[PDB]
Amino acid sequence: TVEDFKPSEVNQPGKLYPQVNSERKVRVQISAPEAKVVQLDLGGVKYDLTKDEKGVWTGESAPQQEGFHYYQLNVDGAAVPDPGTIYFYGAGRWGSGIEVPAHDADFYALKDVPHGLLSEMNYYSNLTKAWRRCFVYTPAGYGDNKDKRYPVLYLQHGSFEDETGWGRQGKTNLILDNLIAAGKAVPMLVVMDNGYATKPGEKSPFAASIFEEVLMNEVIPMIDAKFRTLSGREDRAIAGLSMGANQTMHIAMNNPGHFAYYGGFSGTLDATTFLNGKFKDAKAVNVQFKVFFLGLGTAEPHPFPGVVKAFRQMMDKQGIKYVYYESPDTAHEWLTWRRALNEFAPLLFK
Amino acid sequence: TVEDFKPSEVNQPGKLYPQVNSERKVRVQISAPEAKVVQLDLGGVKYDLTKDEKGVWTGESAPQQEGFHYYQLNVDGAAVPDPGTIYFYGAGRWGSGIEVPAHDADFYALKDVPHGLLSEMNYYSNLTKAWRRCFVYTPAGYGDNKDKRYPVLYLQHGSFEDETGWGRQGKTNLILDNLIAAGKAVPMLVVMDNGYATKPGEFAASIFEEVLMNEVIPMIDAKFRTLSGREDRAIAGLSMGANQTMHIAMNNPGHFAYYGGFSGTSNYPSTEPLDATTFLNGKFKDAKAVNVQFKVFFLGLGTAEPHPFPGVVKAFRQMMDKQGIKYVYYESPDTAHEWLTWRRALNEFAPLLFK
Ligand SMILES: [Cl-]
Asked: Beta strand pairing status for A45-48 and A38-42?
């Protein structure tokens, strides 16, 4: 392995490991002097670490794709976070992640530009009878012209993630900070809620979702009431990744009077029956949407490329306009969706 | 042991352990089929868990004091977070914490009241030549009242913590939400920064005072609708932060009219008598001037804090009493040098500000 390893940007303050080298290999290190086996569990592959005389374990992965990857350590059967990194919510857990620098990483860099606030908002939902929480990005100049109003993008995570995903893993505030400062995107709010919403009684993962109801009756009215927003349909966009792409498509198509932009990133056909035949009327769709956007990673596994393919095929045959973007050499992971957002946001509200 | 155990409120979604019973015992569980020894390190005590036939380890602590406690697991030598909990920054790491329900926990509860925003703010410091981050609480009515302006509390964490502490394990936004809604505290901003600040390229000397006075406060007063007079600005901290903010307050009497010291004063770690003439550059020499400077001077302490914190505060208080300098004193019953003590101190301190 090439020895130009450096601490990742995900490291806890003062922690030297994990590290990444120019081969995009990840090196982890942990002290466990009584352990029999210690492993790095990354990219669906287990790597055995090697123990030195002092009982310190060190090892490296094979080369990783650029960007962000969840991982964990295995210590004699214990699946645990790496004490070396900050933690992220995904795969149904708070756990470790590693950042492997990308060639285009500058578009989500922390730059010397005006930075918008990222705000936590707690609210009670009468529909779910539970406490909820969303995060809201306001652009840097939001506090300048106090008569000015802004459009809003509602941006949703995937399965087994939560409302913190887009803001942390997804670097949404930095992407928009940069796009806005560069004059590529209109100043906008971004609202990130939790796509899990069920009726009071139900805890089952196959229970019916009422996220559409929550977004339309509790979230959006609250945002438009509490922030200086433009609340017309041409001022409101919706998008999501994976499960969230499907959710937000459903919401957009069911509420044509309230969204004029849709973005489906790596979502998971007879236009007469599909989605209650909402794609039947090709003219109605093209009229609703100023922007209908589809995103995919070139390295995504089955079934995501197939899903997007069949969808485009239906679109093409129906004469429904859409924009399509492919993230090179990324899979069903966060860099794909960082890039999708970076390509999608500049199309909005123009 | 009373089998009263229920999932803690710090558990990750869908995780059954850790759990707490009515004895305030903490039960943890983790699967480690090949492990030889798994331990719970909590309250300064290591408890050996027991392994069952499915490779799963379970064990429980002694009764804990009420409130929030940092902890970790040990797995065959590896000091690791508990996969069962969300994580907190403290003790120099992101790691586990347990919440043992307090009898008065209602005051930091998530209640059906108007809720203010907690905002992340990133900024570059030319004094430290580094990127920094603070968190800002704005009151629930901040947006509704576009012409209204608000006073500001600057609130600092302890050693080996950071700008997220007061907001997360400190529950600052909920405490203020509740106090403000209850009409007990004036609607205010709370600004939570990182007490660590050093010169570029530098146990190094702190320049946090310079960063706070010359970069943060001007930034906040420039970006938010604040009242920016000394009588509209308060400062306070816990442990190390109590020390730092005392230094800052006494050096900058023309910018602060309120100080709060939670489990810490600047004579730390000494428990010996103070000389007002020389202590802290004689800033407490003129008792009359100090009494005029401060509308509120607040000291907090847990009744179960370890040596030397009680002795440190006692010596400071005796200095104060002798000088005839007034102060408010609050004791948190049955808590030590930990976050519930400081939650309670904020709850008592905040209602005294800007009145
Ligand atoms: Cl962080």
From this structure: antiparallel
The amino acid at B48:
D
Give this entry's resolution in angstroms.
1.7
Report the C-alpha gap between A224 and A75 in whole angstroms.
49
Question: Taking the C-alpha atoms of A104, A310, A157 and A7 in order, what is their torsion angle to the nearest 10 degrees?
Answer: -30
User: Closest Cα of chain A to B99: distance in Å?
Assistant: 17
Q: Residue A225 has which token pair? A: 């009431």
- Look up residue B320 and give its two tokens: 């104060």
- HEC states along B144-168? CCCCCCECEEEEECCCCCCCCCCCC
**What kind of experiment solved this structure?**
X-ray
Query: Kind and range of the H or E element at A263?
Result: strand A261-265
Which residues of chain A are within 8 Å of residue B55 when distances are taken between CB atoms?
77
- Cβ partners under 8 Å of residue B35, min gap 6: A75, A76, A77, A78, B51, B57, B75, B76
Nearest chain A Cα distance for residue B12, angstroms: 7
Strand partners, A122: A133
Nearest by CB to A120, from B37, B117, B121: name it.
B117
Residue with tokens 């942990």: A30
Q: From the CA of B237, how far away is ligand 1's center (Å)?
A: 21
Name the residue among B81, B224, B203 with its Cα closest to residue B152. B224
The two beta strands, A87-90 and A93-100, are antiparallel
